[PDB]
Structure formats: C-alpha cells, structure tokens
Amino acid sequence: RMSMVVSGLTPEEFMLVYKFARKHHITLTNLITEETTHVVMKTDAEFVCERTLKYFLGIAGGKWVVSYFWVTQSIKERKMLNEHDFEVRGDVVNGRNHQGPKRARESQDRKIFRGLEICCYGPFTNMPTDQLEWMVQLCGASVVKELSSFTLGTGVHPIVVVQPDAWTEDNGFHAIGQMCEAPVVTREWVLDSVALYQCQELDTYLIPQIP
C-alpha cells in the first residue's frame, strides 16, 4: 500500500513530505517504481505542474498524480485529505485543465495506446530510452526494438518515435522510411498523448521521409 515519489520539490519541500510520509507510514522514495501508488507534483495554486518523467509515468501507470498541496494542507489539518481533491489538473504544455491524470485512472480499462506497436528509435535526451518504452508499455503499446522487426499483419498499427534534436545538425532520419513502412513521429506525439491521456493524431508530429 501507499508508496510516494516526489517531483519538482526542493530538498526542503521533500522533508515536509518525509515528515508527512513518516507520520502516516507511507513508503517515500526517490525512484518511481511499479509499487508506487502516488506521484506528488510541485504545482501552482491551480494544480498545474511542469512535465517531468515522473509526471508522465505517474499518468501512464494510472497512479495518483497529486499536487504537493495535498501534503501541506493535510499537514495543516493534521489529517490526511482526499487525493481526489488535489489531483493534478493539467500542465504548462498541454493545458491547465485537461484532467489527464484523472482520465488515466478512469481509463485503465481502455488504454490509449491499445493495439499499437511502437519503437523508440534513435537517441534520447533527459529521458532514458528504456523509460520512454516503459511509458508506452504502461499505456498499452507493444514495444519493438529493431526497425525491420514490426509485426506484419492488419490488427496492428506500427509507430516509429524519434527525438529529432537528439542527433547531428545535419540530417539523417528523414530516412527511417527506407528501413520500414511505419509512420515516424517526434517524441512529442507520445508525451502529448500521455499527458492528456488521449491518443493524438500523428499528423502534426509526422516527420517527412525520403524514399
């Protein structure tokens, strides 16, 4: 039961949480795992946070992604308040009230990446490629590792995800087509879809491919 993770907190705020986790006997730690039940995000007064890896994974796993205000206010009323009353409402990129967290929780029966095959191809900054994979997994996708490896039939949609600025300042990936028939999209297609917890159209994320 109850296992916390923190994101965007200074060491200082981390202690108020430790003091809070101590009292209520919650397993508080630095690394986000499969046993984690809550992701506590630093937010503004309106429960909007910035997008960190933990934010994406908290959503993907259908965990409680709650404002750090849940801790401070509980600490204030000496009693552990309801997570729902402090759930993150959105972020600085995809919308302030998109309700992605709550949608992830209420959509565990219908994962957005359901029936999709995705290969995180290429280099990736600030987010280990293995994390980006676990993220598409938790969201229901099937992970591939090898461009020429995708499943060849019609009950499955293959997707190639890349971070264009994670290589150089000369081109070379408008050529991933020559290695498959799968559409290639920037990593933003995953981040946006996951944050809003709604599979997005590939259109604005498509990367022009040579023949």
């Binding site: 994101s7 965007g8 990129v93 600030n126 920037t186």
Partner: peptide
C-alpha cells in the same frame, strides 16, 4: 514551477 534537478519537457 519545478524546483528540482529533474528535467522538464516543455518543448522539442
């Protein structure tokens, strides 16, 4: 908002 060493993804 975020005040940790944790990277943020607000663009690419």
């Amino acid at each position: 908002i975020s005040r940790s060493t944790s990277p943020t993804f607000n663009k690419q």
